[model samples]
Target chain A: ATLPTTASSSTAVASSQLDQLANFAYNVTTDSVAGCTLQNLRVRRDWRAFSKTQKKDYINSVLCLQKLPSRTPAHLAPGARTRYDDFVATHINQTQIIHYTGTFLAWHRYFIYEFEQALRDECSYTGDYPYWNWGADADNMEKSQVFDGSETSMSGNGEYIPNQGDIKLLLGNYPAIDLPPGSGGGCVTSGPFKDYKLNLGPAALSLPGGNMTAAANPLTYNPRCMKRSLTTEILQRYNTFPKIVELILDSDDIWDFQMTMQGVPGSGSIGVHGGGHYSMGGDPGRDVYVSPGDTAFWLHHGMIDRVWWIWQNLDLRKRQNAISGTGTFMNNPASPNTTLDTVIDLGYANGGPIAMRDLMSTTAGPFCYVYL
Target chain B: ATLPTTASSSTAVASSQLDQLANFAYNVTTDSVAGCTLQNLRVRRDWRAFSKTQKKDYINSVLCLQKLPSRTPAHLAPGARTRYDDFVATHINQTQIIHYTGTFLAWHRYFIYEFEQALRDECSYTGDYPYWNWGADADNMEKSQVFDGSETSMSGNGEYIPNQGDIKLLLGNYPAIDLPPGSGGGCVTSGPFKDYKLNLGPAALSLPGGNMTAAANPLTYNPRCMKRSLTTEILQRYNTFPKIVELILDSDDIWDFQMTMQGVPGSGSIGVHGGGHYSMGGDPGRDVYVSPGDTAFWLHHGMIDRVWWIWQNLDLRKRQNAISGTGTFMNNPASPNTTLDTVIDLGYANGGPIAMRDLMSTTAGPFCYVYL
Candidate 1:
């Protein structure tokens, strides 16, 4: 599984090296020498605290970034050719400026730190980026380990295929929540991003062939396979861990802690980062606009950047320079103001324009990374 | 309580007088004829099947549509000028074309048949327009009988206000249900819309002056008061009767039974019409956009027009000449089609610009009425 044609040399970095690489990837744990002299800080553990050769070298460097090459060119129309379908075609061409507003958690924490620095400069991938805690498998996600479809999991359930009963959660105009169904709802026969297909999204809530556009065209290819319905009722009802410490201790500010962590619909605060995109269910995990074509969307946004680095080290001098919201995500009266020189436009990726004070810390800018 | 200066004369009619005024308002259970020979066929019932003098003439015709007069005018900027703040100022002036599109359930079934023909012309309310069968108090909406706070109910619960843990619903990109908290959150201090007030909506989800705004102005008189919390987890999980017979025998089509009866956030199809707007929870029952300033939004949309007239009499002419998705609501690949001569407008209030073939049958247009 070769691949590494080098690349990533700081496309973006700063907010104090994003808070000193989030205090050296959340205070450097284990493997000493100050966690190998905090290079790209790294850390991000919980994939059942990795080991079995760090889940086979992070699934052979995400299958060597899906066999490298194709930086989407040949006069655009065809599919995203490789470098892992150009980060699922720049998350399906910046699925409408990244999730319900206010730079949804610093544009997916600089898109899971540029897909873990494109898995260490295109796949020579040395450990680090791995997360799945899902509140330690919140009440049975098919005997967890990122879904038991074993052969080292992340691909079990789907084969069961019963009547698919409860899995409804619809919160917009609220009141609809049945859940239950999981043990998979078709496709992904067995792991390694199950026969890795899922070309660019026919976006919103997994469309595929019937491909009804929210504005399709992430370079078209819209192929198939890789679907999931792995439920655990929105991670045992809104990702527990005492509801992520009651949403960072009942949010005192940061615009009610960024609209209670970007959730407003029925305001029960789906929070805990929309419960890890409904714990990565079907197509692009219920496609809230191109869920980074699920490699469990980079381990469910690396456990939502390790719950915003354990809510910015619980209060590293008031939650590491806590940022407020509004530079519009869910907009409405929201113009409370946003700063750290706002900017953020990864549209057509490779971090062209970054900012919101350089993606505010994970061991600061061009991030170093952490969470164990 | 005299008030009806006449008015409503066929804003739209047909489907054989909308099914002989829905078989004379769910079969004229009594008071023989003369209810005003079926033009706007008002009859809507069920709050513990009415009587005790039809629950004191429907709470004295909703306290005489809150002491008549106030058709929100004087160059519109004041609170709703009575006639029950002109149906909560036409649901805050058609909150974005009556919700998630294709005229949401025929624009709230002609806005609860023009607020039950303005409580029978202004306020001389005699009978009909009642419904509350939250699946017969799904479990314990504060001892049922329309929230037993007496003075003939629809006002109890809210006073409890204690710890409020669960009850969070919010289906924007779906996956956010918490519920349990019930036994009330606040307001509705006792009964008859509790010393009623709620002038015009500060709109979308219960504003009360913390003022959020979807677009506000429905003749602005933004007063306050009436608020609720009543629970029974969305009438025992999505208004039971086996989740309204599994959203009418697992909705074959009609865009999966109108987005599982208007609910497609996370697509559990909040169905039984978003379980009667979260069983009327608070401020215009969890204000899904100016919930007709809460007369339990016309008996929870007369039990979601009696579950879409019992899924259009279970099968009468294959779900009463079924209609499918996209003449736009949550518009997608929709524009698919919609007919019954689609026209629907009812803005200021009642029979304004009706048609979708005079609202597909309650027995047939300028509807007749039905539901015991």
Candidate 2:
């Protein structure tokens, strides 16, 4: 999808030349829609702002993942049970690296969207579902928090609390930090706790308190339905979720966790993310698990996305803390934070500091805006 | 760099137009530069903002990580070790991700620079390190209650600390949480307990506080050097983190407690909810663990680059309390603390109504904002 730019048009903009694009009305007209397949190709073309190198990098990732690895041999159908199982094995074996959470779903979604967009820019009908959603199955056991041993989240359901099902996404009834209304008259809601049903798969296969496996846990990675790569027409049939899903997934990324943690394994390699030929395995920096089956996979990806959603409503103060990064060395040279002593400043070209702590710890002090 | 634009070309200027480009900035200008060896075609360039799709999707993820998996991959080479041990593995892995915590520096400083502008664009670079000063690192592991089961950070001697090197990343000795300045009543220098190092390996690596396996401690995952993938260059090198790391060794997401009762292998693969690929060892979703030798491989995938850093900054209020969502039946589904039933007026596009609970929990509340 990345076209060669006119060499003449390739000039450099001065630091002072940058401007903020805050036209909140979402002007589709100003966007350059090139093809019919890309509903908003004019404005929705992916990677236009990327530098030539960056554009190539994006395409390379796609190409790599699409390649095959020695781990999964040929003859196995992509949908075969053994083939799927082999994919899981490779993923779990790779997740042992600690502390580091690879670029999870944040990038995967981008890859899928961009790849599809590439085809769209080429005037092709390519929609995205290659990247699956593992969190949709609210009712399954594999996703149960109890079996997974996830740090947070719960699942024993004998005693009756208000309405288990009645719990809202926020405010009303939270498991981690419960901040009900009436104390400061902040915010609150009332309702009966609704029933928590495990409606993940086929009607016959669905279990109430779904049966979780030691494999893909119930707590971290529980999607109601793993995605099935469909034909363009089928994709169009389910285009509503897929398209909007891209809107949410793309704009609010967290897939980095998966990327760094797990490189695409087996035959399903979509050729994105250094996934071809030799299969870019591990880097010399640190030695940790780098595969796709970590339980935190889905949830962490969701959280990455959640961060974008979180950013949308931040107040001006929290948004612009000039002292955001005062003394921290953006990166260290001694311990291989990746740079050779060069400090990475989170300061955006436009203005001021962007504290690393604040970005990672959204629940920190003072700034307490909600997503709604 | 973020370049400015205007609708009119300096015709009779109006005050409103002043706000358009604000500073007379030009539109995107590209450039070329040589790399390694000089070549006419080889080039370098800058962009105004991420393309519309990139702004919405790829900008938040996979477009970057697949390129640079490690920093100077050669370790056996005499000169490379220092850069490798110090810069690549230590500094980058440790400080980078932590930098996202909110230390906006000058490397390529821009936090929502375009967010306020009309275009709604996204852009980033890979020149600096993003530091994460571990405030909790300075504390005595045994004395700190926050340790839970996760094993406290380091000791005053720094011996017990897993990644003492990262401690230097701290600007001054400041408290991790709640600090109201020191005796001077003004912000004091970094506190002894303020700064600590990031091990970038694992919590179990700590010693002196010795030999604690999965002690079922809340602090198990918590450690000074608990190893995280958000290293130093995370801001600059978005593609450094891997796209996936499957962790499904065996157990599904089901609660640990449930597994004990059911006599199921807490760590074996079993489909959480149901289906063909459930618990299948070959399931590609199980790839989270990575060997120490290949740890850096995760960052190379670029999913981290796809994270919608701009969108996640929303306030807690907007995310929760007011949102609502229903199933195909028109009725809200049941959730633990959060559910569609609890939130009343929120919508698919209308924004959120729940609280942080729903946003973080991902179950009960409605979406507060849409990145699109």
Candidate 3:
């Protein structure tokens, strides 16, 4: 798997050419172009609608089966049968109680996404995603009611449902991570951002103007905090809104939630209802919905993905022959001897041997969509 | 609720009287104690223990709960209705989204405590409560496998079980608040103390020597950015422990996890396996337990409690007609009312309401404690 070492000329294109090359329809795999934003994209809800045979195939393709074995094992793969519990237990030993509780939300979020990615790679299914859509209303959001099982079901109000499309959907079946021509891939982060400092605070049931008036309703935003390194003003600025040079209003509000996001102060968001402000339906253990449903969700995620890509592109000469020797989520499979150096490697789906180079060498590839 | 006028003694005699007063069998109802470090004061993981009886009593006792029903038409109780759907819907409203999901954690924490306080009064339980014991085990502490389903459960070969104590045992029975005896009811407080902050980074979970690795089990202590209002030096002198301060030796490691005491940079010793080198893991929720199980936990909490008591003494009027307060559980009731204007209407459980002047004036009451 060779990287693009063919000088800066081949690698660097003018912005116009870059835009032309970046279009989602320039490839042979798909018959037509996938438009920007919500347009030009085809979405297929209710996979049950697919032919019986196709459904089995689609489910199998994406590894979306019930009672699947735990994804991570204690040691390296293939040699042992360490209970999945062992892997988690050992990690907990490594984590502080703060991260210990919050990561359950973070890691579980990724766990669902990886499966969804596996699905997208296989089915190429695309459609308006079903969101739990927790933050869409206000009078009824009470923290104790949703989170503490004061509601009808422990699963809370989260269920897969079609969208009205009136409210802007930022996350859940986002365009950028939608790989394999409409199939939902990529990642999803929910709850509140970077707020682990509080676990049992008021439900924030007050309408915009008023303070909490005694009985707290369930928090609309299931706030969690990210590590400070990840939530610093610099990182927060880089993650939300426009990519690269463009910037969004770093509202004082968004910054505050990130500060004390997940009940505590420093864990990232991971659910929609039961404290999730943007959680649309899709459990990490089950569905493929990633990024929940916040509009800003994907923008922030794109930046995160972009960071990985940047890390991949770190002055190659200084650190050459990197995975695929290119950057980010390349498809090149590492040799049996290669060790995944960072989170990128751990990100691999059951679609094994996909190396960083494979991802680097291709952009949208033959079957992917480019979300701006 | 009349507070004693004065002890009619000198400062040295007053110190002894204050010590005696502090020594009474303090319980939750008599006075509410600050739990572990300031951060862990938020009630968490304890909601499940709240019995139906407790809930009903809380609802009945809290004036806010009673009024909330009339304040908002949808003024719902915890289990009054199926709120999940409505909750999610409200979460989608733009204004609510920004306010609830984004800017609410800060304000919410404050409100939740007020709810807890109200519930305490309703229960008629008594005791000066303590915070959670985060500093309990130090490094020998095994991570809780229950919530995170980690492998570190003591059922297996958990490394730090002996020193850390049994999590299961701790959870066996709920601990109620208890008010200490013998106070001529008086509210005492110093001016609001300055807030604290620290500079923490994200070097914990990187390539190698990550804090969680078993190799360097008790990783080097890392200090974070302290609050502008508070400094390491001030905390040490005010709290009285200069020998415990030490900088994090490892520069490469930068991830900052909020472990309360770690907030104080350059404090405590560092070595393998719960050595006296540095103690951590005292309860942050209860009175005491500041530095991971160090005796400093109690000392620090005592100081905070002292401040509150001091505030009561400063105000002369409120002390005249105070009564005992309640706790989360059934043990003792709390001091009747703790309004900003109505100060000094509180005291430890044992004695009748003493005058505010007496607490500051003479310092002698029936209080007693020998540890300090």
Candidate 4:
């Protein structure tokens, strides 16, 4: 779902442009973190902070990944045909193990960094990756700059397919959530990713009358247009500034921070993490497993990492190294808790293992970035 | 808990040792697997299948691992001082995630193979790794060639202490089990590894009157001597030939097979997998999390791989690549089911990701060995 930008946008916010940098900088190098001096820090900012041209470059780079050949084997993901699909396939394959597991934050932290790096390395695009602040778009999600069907946006919402009223999110236990369908549904037809055909999945979904169940093989070739029924309710209810503040300041332990942030599956509460994806609201975006196909997945997760990064900055020693929970989804069958020594091997990413300790901080070990 | 070899056992079962090979071979290359021709297959055998000299070499290689410097960082594992401890540290860190999960079989299959490779390359020892046939050792647990505490065995029982009586294993849900104490208890006084001081853990243990709970930082330094009680009851009751037969022949799917093999904790039953360790009977051996600290760990897991290998041979199309269960312990917190595409990564093992499909057969990918 990537699109091209005006070429000049490549250097919109040049590395030397430290003017607006301080606003987003977390200043973590003081902790004596190697490979991360203040001079070399890559400061990330909100989606609106980026100039219009920069967003276009971000869009172009994503398109670049779509055109490149996939690193994943066909046997592993039959439909994966591009570099973009590789990331999608990885998310698709690990849907169960990554979320709700202790490795949740860092796994995605590493995942988004890898995707951003791919955009820069493979596509030769130069622009800070953006973070979509759902709260900023809560008033009217459709008209927001991130999805206003504009040339500088993350494409627009899916085409409206009526008769689809309030959608039921029945994938909960204590209570089911009924979300009002906002603007679009069937297919995304107005922006950058209009032609982007998803190759892997729509593993889960919410609809007027029913929800789409995951298939036996979610990675098989099931090509379809990207669809998103953009909604404000999911964002307004779950992504409020107060809740975000609670997420950052409420928990003393990593387990509760992550558990509550990701929401306790059937607790009738879809945390900010869930709300962002649901705000996109249809097809791949709605299906948590295959959300990366929605193009905005990177932007949404960029913010997840930012919040975690900010959380880590609050108290380096305690927050940076904090890690809890097992390695599976909510520890369903039950597992031992996680420790810093736990290794998270993301297959071919750098072709090495990454310990939880290495990923606990943004300014340490293969990371040298900060967020606003 | 690794011990020594009498040098000459290195080549007793030579590369061209094809006489006893057929009995152990399952002839999988006919299925067109590469890097696994019959001529090149390293057919693993039962402990008894090896000459007394071979066991000596096996023991020696283990000691060699102990002498090598540690690859793990001190911060990650305060006590990891040798190569042997590296394997132990990995197990200690992942104790909660690996067991009862779908990746259990293949993850360990790869783990055992990596250790075998380390023995061959790092220690320069050259005998095929042996599998302890607990069913064979069922009659006289201590006297079985594998751990009679003789110079050639894994090591003899721990030093006998008084009033130990029956040990209670109360870490279960529906029920708790009490195991009668064997002859020894305090320290392993008769084996090659008797003098080998452990530096990692006895994290979980079944003591006479109390169970040793896992520490918060289990990878922390904890030095102690190897200990074993060598009980025959655990093996005779749980590792019987009939049960092993049932494990291999009864299940039509991999999920049930692994779950039953690993046993449902607190179900008043410890699967055959549990019996083999409890058979070792004390301290590190009894503590499921830190069991690898015991010298007998390799042999036990080797047999786990063998039984799985034999099971796979029965129906390659069905069992060869069979994988189910989540990626956590028994799916404790509950997780998504695993797939062949699921990656089972061991940090620095060739610095790459190894998928469940690759580790399915002993004669495919990074493995080219089979059990006799």
Q: For this target, which candidate reaches the highest lDDT against the unseen true structure?
A: 4
Give interface RMSD, every candidate, in order: 10.2, 17.6, 23.0, 7.1
Per-structure clash totals for the candidates: 68, 337, 203, 28
Against the hidden reference, what TM-scores do the models get? 0.33, 0.20, 0.28, 0.54
Better of 2 and 3 by lDDT: 3
What local lDDT score does residue A118 receive in model 2, on the 0 to 100 scale? 36
Off by over 4 Å in 3: A1-115, A121-243, A246-304, A307-311, A317-372, B1-236, B240-304, B312-372
Candidate 4 chain B: worst-modelled 10 consecutive residues by lDDT: B1-10
lDDT of 1 by residue, B1-372 (tens): 221222222322222333343454344322323323445445566777677778878788878878877654546536666777766776665554455665677778778877777777877776877887665566777788777788888677676667655544443323544555456667777877677877665445532223333332445666777767777777777765555545555666555766776666655546667667766676667656577776666787777777676556545557665765433334321222345766766555555777776777764556666676
Candidate 1 vs 4: which has more lDDT: 4
Q: What is the TM-score of chain B alone in each candidate?
A: 0.30, 0.18, 0.21, 0.89
Residues A83-199, candidate 1: write the lDDT tens digits.
777777766655533555556777777877776777878688877778776656777777887777766666655555666545444422344444455556668778666787777
Candidate 2 per-residue lDDT over residues B87-175, each given as its tens digit: 22322222221121111110111111111111111124322111111112112222222111121211111112123122111111122
Instruction: Please say which candidate is ahead in DockQ: 3 or 4.
Output: 4
True contacts kept of each: 0.00, 0.00, 0.00, 0.09
Q: Least lDDT summed over 10 consecutive residues: which range in candidate 2 chain B?
A: B274-283
Give the per-residue Cα lDDT of candidate 1 at A94: 50
Q: Model 4, residue A291: displacement in angstroms?
A: 1.6
